[PDB]
Symmetry: C3
Amino acid sequence: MLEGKFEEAALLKKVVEAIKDCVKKCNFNCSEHGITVQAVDDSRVLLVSLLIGQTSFSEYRCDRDVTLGIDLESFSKIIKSANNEDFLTLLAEDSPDQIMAILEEKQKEKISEYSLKLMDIDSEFLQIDDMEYDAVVNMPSSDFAKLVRDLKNLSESLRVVVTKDSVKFTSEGDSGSGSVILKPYTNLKNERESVTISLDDPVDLTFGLKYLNDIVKAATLSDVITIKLADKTPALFEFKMQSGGYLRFYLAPKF
Amino acid sequence: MLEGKFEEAALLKKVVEAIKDCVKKCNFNCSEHGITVQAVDDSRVLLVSLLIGQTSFSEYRCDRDVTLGIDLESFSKIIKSANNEDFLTLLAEDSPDQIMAILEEKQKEKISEYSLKLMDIDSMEYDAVVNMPSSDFAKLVRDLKNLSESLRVVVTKDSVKFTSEGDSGSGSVILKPYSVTISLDDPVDLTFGLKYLNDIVKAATLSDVITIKLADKTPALFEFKMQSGGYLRFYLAPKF
Amino acid sequence: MLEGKFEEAALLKKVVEAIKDCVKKCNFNCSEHGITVQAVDDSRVLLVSLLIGQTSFSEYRCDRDVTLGIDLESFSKIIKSANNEDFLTLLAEDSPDQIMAILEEKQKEKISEYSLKLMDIDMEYDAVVNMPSSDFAKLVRDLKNLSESLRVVVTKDSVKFTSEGDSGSGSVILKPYTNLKNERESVTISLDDPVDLTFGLKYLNDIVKAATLSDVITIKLADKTPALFEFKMQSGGYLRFYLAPK
């Protein structure tokens, strides 16, 4: 069974918005640990890995695992109705036919109750990869979102070059080229707006800006984006949720 | 004749915006007691009833009744030009072919004079009454429109329940007095087209409270009282 | 060659945005005087004249004149990515193939470097009105809703803008005044002759986009000659539009 109550709907609204476009449908796997999603986009290039840990809820009971196959388009029309501050409770029975979402307004006598019918993904999507990487970059999600959009105007490729001194993003098309170069630095007031680099080996990889443009919509889930790169390995783009959990994207470079 | 001065253009601006979508043209009926509008949508399903009483004006002279057939989109382009705090005067002569709108800026040396040509247009007891904030009702109408073309409304002594079902899921919004006020003789169970309700809730600009009155197989009333002294009312038939 | 550094990118951003609609491509002529642009619309009705004087730069060297033919849409994609507060440096070498724009973010170790390839590209007045550019922008937009031409009538005591269409007419009348708290919010009229000219609101709608560059618009009118719409940039320089009446 599933009974998960959020203090605030903001988190689940931001999650559904961040993935709904590159992912049309997916399985929400619920267990005592929390709720997870493993999915791939339609072109089978971009891997999405989500974890909403038990700790992100105020009340969470899932005494028996349940899988919920959910159309994210339909679920977004439901969840978008909620105020960020609303209580939000997800309910599903054992062997469920549907998911229920109940919204409760904080300082109002208003309760909204929604029910979405489930789909059978009828192919559990499995995924596991704790990995070793050549280089790891931590930088503000907002700056990385902005350079992706800005450099998409010039071409469909983003070259990424990491050394101990700097990270360099470049994009060249027929109009002209653009490079954005960041060096490690500390923001003393708010360490989350710092840039850090730790590497074994220098890295030089190219990614399709179409997919990076989808990834960076998750910038609403965390101030910080962790980028992990390896020489012939899918790069990790990680958004850690402060309440506990994460949203991750895996994207192969171009070869 | 007609000479009506408003202290502020806000009221007319809100009025024209609230109805211009549901009603593209309509007659303004000026009288010794104020300005009236009775209009029906193209579908002949929605009745719009407007009263701007003479008390809404700082100065109002209408020695003899006059009808002003106005294309609301054209009028909307003129009246949108005004600041909310502008003086606004409406002028029309006997047997008029146009309406005149004079805007005077409070804090500047700016006077604007507009003229729009007229067109010729051709002219109680309820089971339950709900009061709720217009903003809340506007929000649930929009939110549930995403699920269905129909909004079911079910009123009892202890609750009001709005439901909307479709292929992307069902949704129900439940308001309790225990936020909302409810007065009922009979319980009520009516269904309305959300396309029309979506137009009605635009009048939330005129009033923080919406009064909804329903009856078994009667047009429901959606009332927005202007605290200047008029009202904007929408009458909408249920289905079946 | 060109090396001009701005303390803030805001100026160039607003300049590029103000003209990129009326003008698709243009030459940036750089000299020790500064950077200027002279271009005319596709309709051959509107002449755009820009001057970014060297006084608007914190550092400016141009030891030799250079002409930079630039696609403004491409260039806007670049310049709009900058924050207003960013350091902005324009570079070009002698006999250039491209223009370079370097953005430095304040308070960060973040430097963006862009380069776009170049292309080859080729009075006495009766009355002067000064008024807030906001107020002129607003009346243009409001009266564009009723017709495609704006009549302008200037006397010692008033300025009158009218616009008549098949729906209806509308007129806006302004009187001179001095604003004692902020002189820039004044309306001033000084004329030899009264003036009565009509202009296309299609073009005026493009002109008023320059209201981002200055609080004040100066309008200079003469019978049967092009009217001047001037936006003086306080940092030093101007953006001018010349528009023939009908």
